[PDB]
A paper describes a structure:
GlcB generates malate and coenzyme A (CoA) from glyoxylate and acetyl coenzyme A (AcCoA) following the conversion of isocitrate to succinate and glyoxylate by ICL. Because of the essentiality of the glyoxylate shunt in infection and the absence of it in humans, both ICL and GlcB are attractive targets for drug discovery. A Mg2+ ion required for activity is bound at the bottom of the active site tunnel in an octahedral coordination by one oxygen each from the carboxylate side chains of Glu-434 and Asp-462, two water molecules, and two oxygens of glyoxylate.
We repeated the experiment following the method of Smith et al., crystallizing GlcB after incubation with substrates and capturing the products formed in the active site. The enzyme crystallized after longer preincubation with the substrates (60 min) resulting in a refined model of the GlcB-malate complex. The active site loop is closed as malate still maintains a weak hydrogen bond with the backbone nitrogen of Leu-461 (3.0 Å) but is too far to hydrogen bond with the Phe-460 backbone (3.5 Å). Moreover, we observed the later stages of the catalytic cycle in the malate-bound structure after CoA dissociation, and we obtained the complete GlcB apo structure in crystals from the longest incubation with an excess of substrates in the reaction mixture.
Author numbering: 3 to 303, 309 to 727
The structure:
């Protein structure tokens, strides 16, 4: 336990991992590496600390600003000049264009779904990386896109009618995406390859594609292919053919399945979807990350799950070519705020988890750039670039600091400059109002921006905590600030020249069980100009790819350039309740909803160390809860409590009223301790109660300190 290197005390469980598993193959001298680590942690920590204090300073000045201006309607011009003078608002920089080179085509060119997965879960990570290709049949059958109404529902045995509905859906999709010259795919009787072009055998005629350029390849014999590979809007569509199969004999063409290129890119998350409070957890995360970059990562289930090898097809000509079988992987480090053990000072204080993440993740990602016996067969980046998305950055200063950190890390690892690219999240109000500046700060490392509306909502609440009673969270979608936020985001991205160089991304779909609703509504994002959008599951990625097959994102971006449909005054518009009063029924509805949402997530975060749970709301609708939604739910209550809408008695009564209901949900597990009826002695209950009753004092409303504290406290009160 504990190993002293330089002025650092490094936990043994980390030192062993880094020196025995990560370092070998990176051609980096362990002594030189650790020395560089000590030097970086020494040089950048004070500059790092100044930023976190600036957050508390700025927030304090604004908090006081609301106190001495009560009841009266807020004067927006005074607000603007105030944020201007205090530094919260920065001048709009001179127009420019990024020059981030050495980026893979999956980011610069290809537009499609993007996955986000907790890296601590091997299975979900493997499925995420393998979600590059996903069955449309399984996605249509398994989900509610095809209703179980009049016709046929689901059951233990395969359903014929539902299967035919799925097939019909897929056929219509094929007709709409890669259309035939005349007729429909629903009438196809077979597929052949004659003279370098695709020939579809209809009962009436025989035909090719309306534009044969959409024919990308095939497998097997030319006159009897096992699969036909097509392409639309950069996304590949694969039609599996096996007339004498499980689904082939039923189909009138022998089509077994329709595989779609789904998750183009995948985010390996070390933040809001995971629970890592100590050294061992970080070691697990880094372990799975290492397995991902090496390619030897596996997970058993009566068989074993591994990463997909690259796919190989026959070109229309006759030669064999190869498409990527895995998703291009980003990795999301933690924010600047939180610290961690693992390595500590000579004194005894924790070290910024962000720096650690930069160094370690950066080090590990080197394996995924090369293909050998030491580094592992599977190669992540073909262009030789490390893609790291940095979340929760407050402004151009912090962005620039992340750039400096990345530069230093690249110096340590011996990587050429700008090897480690950055995915600037847009989920901070200051970052939102200084977006162009944040982009300019990383105008040679930026690979994407992204609307993280959840943390942006939470930050929006906490920033104007003292301004007055906010509205119910379910109303936040109708507020001007968030729409202006999205539009300004896309506009800034396109103005920066992201079209063909970088990605403009949009937030997550949380209703995991409402896939029909997702198909219906999520098409708004690619129609809004979003080069990419976040999906909760591989299936959801498969279903979300449809939108990109229907919407020409590139053309939308071309038709969106120059337009400025977002004013700064709309961005600073606080989502106050104005002069609206809710009925006690609505009040207690919102309170109980929030409390259930809090409990259901914090109980699994604290006890079982799960950073992302499928928790239902109060209307019995399964949502996907992580730190962001928890943050919104906590800050909302911390607002209503701090403005006399509700009291501590109300929130306690609601928590005690919703605690047994949450127990009902998790009463099927094995390692689940019922937090009832002894509410006072449950660490999870205390965690929730503190998250609510002290959320107003949390730095930028962040939920990391409390969660980590209670998680450590749980691990301690169970070790014996
Ligand atoms: Mg976030």
């Amino acid at each position: 336990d504990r190993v002293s290197v330089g002025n650092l005390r490094i936990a043994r469980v980390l030192y062993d991992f880094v020196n025995n598993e990560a370092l070998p193959g990176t051609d980096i001298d362990p002594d030189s590496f650790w020395a560089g680590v000590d030097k970086v942690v020494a040089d950048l920590t004070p500059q790092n600390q100044a930023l976190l204090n600036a957050r508390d300073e700025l927030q304090a000045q604004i908090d006081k600003w609301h106190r001495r201006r009560v009841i009266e309607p807020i004067d927006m011009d005074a607000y603007r000049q105030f944020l201007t003078e205090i530094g919260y608002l920065l001048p709009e920089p001179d127009d420019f264009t990024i020059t981030t080179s050495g980026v893979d085509a999956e980011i610069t060119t290809t537009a499609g779904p993007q996955l986000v997965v907790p890296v601590l879960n091997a299975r979900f990570a493997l499925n995420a990386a393998n979600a590059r290709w996903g069955s449309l049949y399984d996605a249509l059958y398994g989900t509610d896109v095809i209703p179980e109404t009049d016709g046929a529902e689901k059951g233990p045995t395969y359903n014929k009618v539902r299967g035919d509905k799925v097939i019909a859906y897929a056929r219509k999709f094929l007709d709409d995406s890669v259309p035939l010259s005349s007729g429909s795919f629903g009438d196809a009787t077979g597929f052949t390859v004659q003279d370098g072009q695709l020939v579809v055998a209809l009962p009436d005629k025989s035909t090719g594609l309306a534009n044969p350029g959409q024919f990308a390849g095939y497998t097997g014999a030319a006159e009897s292919p096992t699969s036909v590979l097509l392409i639309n809007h950069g996304l590949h569509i694969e039609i599996l053919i096996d007339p004498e199969s499980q689904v082939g004999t039923t189909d009138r063409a022998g089509v077994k399945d329709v595989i779609l290129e789904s998750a183009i890119t995948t985010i390996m998350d070390f933040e809001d979807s995971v629970a890592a409070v100590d050294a061992a957890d970080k070691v697990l995360g880094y372990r799975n990350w290492l397995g991902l970059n090496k390619g030897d990562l596996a997970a058993a289930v009566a068989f074993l799950r591994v990463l997909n090898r690259d796919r190989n097809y026959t070109a229309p000509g006759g030669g064999q070519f190869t498409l990527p079988g895995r998703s291009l992987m980003f990795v999301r480090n933690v924010g600047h705020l939180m610290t961690n053990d693992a390595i500590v000072d000579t004194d005894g204080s924790e070290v910024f988890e962000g720096i650690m993440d930069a160094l370690f993740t950066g080090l590990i990602a080197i394996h995924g750039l090369k293909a050998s016996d030491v580094n592992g067969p599977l190669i992540n980046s073909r262009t030789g670039s490390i893609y790291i998305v940095k979340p929760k950055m407050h402004g151009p200063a912090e962005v620039a600091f992340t750039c400096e950190l990345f530069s230093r890390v690249e110096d340590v690892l011996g990587l050429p400059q700008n090897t480690m690219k950055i995915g600037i999240m847009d989920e901070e109000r200051r970052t939102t109002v200084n977006l162009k500046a944040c982009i300019k700060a990383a105008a040679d490392r930026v690979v994407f921006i992204n609307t993280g509306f959840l943390d942006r909502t939470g930050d929006e609440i906490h920033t104007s905590m003292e301004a007055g009673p906010m509205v119910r969270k379910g109303t936040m979608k109708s507020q001007p600030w968030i729409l202006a936020y999205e539009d300004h985001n896309v506009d800034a991205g396109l103005a920066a020249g992201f079209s063909g160089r970088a990605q403009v991304g949009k937030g997550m779909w949380t209703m995991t069980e409402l896939m029909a609703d997702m198909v219906e509504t999520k098409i708004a994002q690619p129609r809004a100009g979003a080069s990419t959008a976040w999906v909760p599951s591989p299936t959801a990625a498969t279903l979300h790819a449809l939108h990109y097959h229907q919407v020409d994102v590139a053309a939308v971006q071309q038709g969106l350039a120059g337009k400025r449909r977002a004013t700064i005054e709309q961005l600073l518009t606080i989502p106050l309740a104005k002069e609206l009063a809710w009925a006690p029924d609505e009040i207690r509805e919102e309170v109980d909803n929030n409390c259930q949402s809090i409990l259901g997530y914090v109980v699994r975060w604290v006890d079982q160390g799960v950073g992302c749970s499928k928790v239902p709301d109060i209307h019995d609708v399964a949502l996907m809860e992580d730190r962001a939604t928890l943050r919104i739910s906590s800050q909302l209550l911390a607002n209503w409590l701090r403005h006399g809408v509700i009291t501590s008695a109300d929130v306690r009564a609601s928590l005690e009223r919703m605690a047994p209901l949450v127990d009902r949900q998790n009463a099927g597990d094995v390692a689940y301790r019922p937090m009832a009826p002894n509410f006072d002695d449950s660490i999870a209950f205390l965690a929730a109660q503190e998250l609510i009753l002290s959320g107003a004092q949390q730095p930028n409303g962040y939920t990391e300190p409390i969660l980590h504290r209670r998680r450590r406290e749980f691990k301690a009160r169970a070790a014996e």
